[PDB]
Write a structure and sequence with these properties.
The complex is a heterodimer of chains A (15) and B (111). Chain A is largely without helices or strands and 15 residues long. Chain A is 0% helix and 0% strand. Chain A contains no helices and no strands. Chain A is elongated. The N and C termini of chain A lie far apart (27 Å). With 111 residues, chain B is largely without helices or strands. The two termini of chain B are 23 Å apart. Classes of the chains: A little secondary structure (15), B little secondary structure (111). Chains A and B meet through loops of A and helix 2 of B. Chain A: It is found in: Host membrane. Chain A: It comes from Murine polyomavirus (strain BG) (MPyV). Chain A: This is Middle T antigen. Chain B: This is Phosphatidylinositol 3-kinase regulatory subunit alpha.
């Protein structure tokens, strides 16, 4: 579903 | 009205409340990177929520708050997910986990 998930952080490319 | 001089709230996807329901008729399952925000009930424990497609998996997506700015998104002092929109617009963000890693260079920007 499309609820709410805590997470993101600038892409900052791979690792 | 709702924080004028504060937070990016101008990163396209951060249109600003798109109406939950709408979110259903906005990015029902368009494609990944189709970031978007709606915000609602979940306010206390959340920055301004967010809707995106985990590569068609769909999880929920949502931003958190910490020191005024976001949270999980490195609660150090990053309240501008635009610099990356250009700086890092392809490469993945699967840092500690593929929580998102679905791109975000294609914001709904209110169809």
């Amino acid at each position: 579903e499309e609820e709410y998930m805590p997470m993101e952080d600038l892409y900052l490319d791979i690792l | 009205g709702m924080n004028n001089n504060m937070s990016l709230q101008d990163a396209e996807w951060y249109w600003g409340d798109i109406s939950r329901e709408e979110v259903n008729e906005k990015l029902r399952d368009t494609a990944d990177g189709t970031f978007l925000v709606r915000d609602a009930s979940t306010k206390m424990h959340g920055d301004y929520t967010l809707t995106l497609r985990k590569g068609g998996n769909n999880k929920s997506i949502k931003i958190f708050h910490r020191d005024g700015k976001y949270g999980f998104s490195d609660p150090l002092t990053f309240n501008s997910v635009v610099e990356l929109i250009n700086h890092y617009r392809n490469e993945s963000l699967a840092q500690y986990n593929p929580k998102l890693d679905v791109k975000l260079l294609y914001p709904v920007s209110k169809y």
